[PDB]
């Protein structure tokens, strides 16, 4: 091909790292371990894919260039760019089936595969679109991603529901035992819609975002989702399955409300966990007037007991939980005080920030 460009090292490093995200180190096809490079107009585009999702980075070209395209080994090309000195100018051109990279006194010949052979996952139509700060989208995903299933046979749980309603975007994740839901207003009237994003795409989207306020433009199609921020475009196939009707698993009228400091509660559960059964992780909670007692024991008959002062006025009650599910929630909440809402020993608990309803966690108890 005719492709030629010269780009400064630091304009390539983060693009190469981002578009290499979808690559898993042991590709099934050799071209899947490659990045597609394309020069057109004054832009270099870099694309990496795993057939389910793809990451694209755009790089403006201010130095002389020639259009064309090829695919190049991702790890090797990234490692070469990163290994060159700070401020190095990286000149790239094609010589037959080889890509020549030259910088200073360094020269590299990499094997290529034709750009016409690279997969394409961009040919679809947007049906819902909106913009939001990337920090808001990062929060939505972090608040809930830990509750996604891993390799469940119910494949539609191995992912995250993204749901639009009114002016809100909501994420939902569940593994059938616990659920997380987080809702954020984005100030745009949206149609009622929901799609499932596969877990690997969710994780990769999260990793493409930082905590800035820079706008992220989201487009949702019939079978794909696309997120554009800065000079990066993430696209993922959607999961073709039906998500559970999560609104019907939220406790309807919890008559018992407990509030406690998040750190004290988390630390108490974390210590009790040490003496819980390593496989089933069950702990007992005893609630009574302004007091919570947590106990744990394990097959060796070791036992932990924690007592905490809390604000609680409901009836006395004992209920069992998988302590890892509880600690996941308390680690996900980044707040000072937590509210726990209960009904009885066989019904789920709902856990929230005591001062905010934007996130809610529903954990089903254990017989214990």
């Amino acid at each position: 091909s005719h492709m030629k460009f010269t780009v400064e090292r630091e304009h390539l490093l983060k693009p190469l790292q981002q578009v290499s995200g979808p690559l898993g180190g042991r590709p099934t096809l050799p071209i899947l371990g490659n990045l597609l490079l394309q020069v057109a107009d004054g832009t270099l585009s870099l694309t990496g894919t795993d057939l389910e999702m793809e990451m694209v980075a755009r790089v403006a070209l201010v130095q002389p260039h020639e259009p064309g395209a090829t695919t190049v080994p991702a790890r090797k090309f990234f490692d070469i760019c990163r290994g060159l000195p700070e401020g190095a100018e990286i000149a790239v051109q094609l010589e037959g089936e080889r890509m020549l990279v030259r910088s200073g006194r360094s020269r590299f010949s990499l094997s290529t595969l034709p750009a016409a052979d690279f997969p394409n996952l961009d040919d679809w139509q947007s049906e819902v679109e909106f913009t939001l700060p990337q920090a808001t989208m990062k929060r939505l995903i972090e608040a809930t991603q830990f509750s996604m299933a891993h390799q469940d046979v119910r494949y539609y749980l191995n992912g995250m529901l993204f749901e639009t309603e009114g002016e809100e975007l909501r994420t939902v994740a569940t593994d059938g035992h616990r659920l997380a839901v987080c809702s954020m207003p984005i100030g745009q009237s949206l149609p009622s819609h929901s799609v499932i994003v596969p877990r690997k795409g969710v994780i990769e989207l999260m990793r493409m975002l930082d905590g800035g306020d820079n706008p992220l433009r989201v487009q949702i199609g019939s079978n794909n989702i696309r997120a554009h921020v800065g000079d990066f475009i993430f696209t993922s196939k959607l999961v073709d399955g039906r998500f559970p009707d999560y609104r019907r698993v939220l406790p309807k009228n919890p008559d018992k409300h407990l509030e406690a400091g998040c750190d004290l509660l988390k630390q108490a559960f974390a210590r009790a966990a040490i003496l819980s059964n390593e496989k089933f992780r069950g702990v007992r909670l005893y609630v009574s007037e302004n007091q919570l007692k947590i106990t744990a024991n394990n097959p060796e008959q070791e036992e932990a007991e924690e007592i905490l002062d809390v604000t609680y006025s409901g009836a006395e009650m004992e209920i069992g939980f998988n302590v890892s599910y509880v600690l996941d929630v308390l680690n996900a909440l980044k707040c000072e005080n937590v509210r726990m809402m209960l009904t009885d020993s066989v019904s789920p608990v709902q856990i929230e920030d005591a001062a905010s309803q934007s996130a809610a966690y529903v954990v089903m108890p254990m017989r214990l």
């Binding site: 059938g176 616990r178 019907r248 089933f280 017989r367």
Partner: peptide, 5 residues
């Protein structure tokens, strides 16, 4: 462990 659904 009990089921949510």
């Amino acid at each position: 462990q009990a089921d949510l659904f």
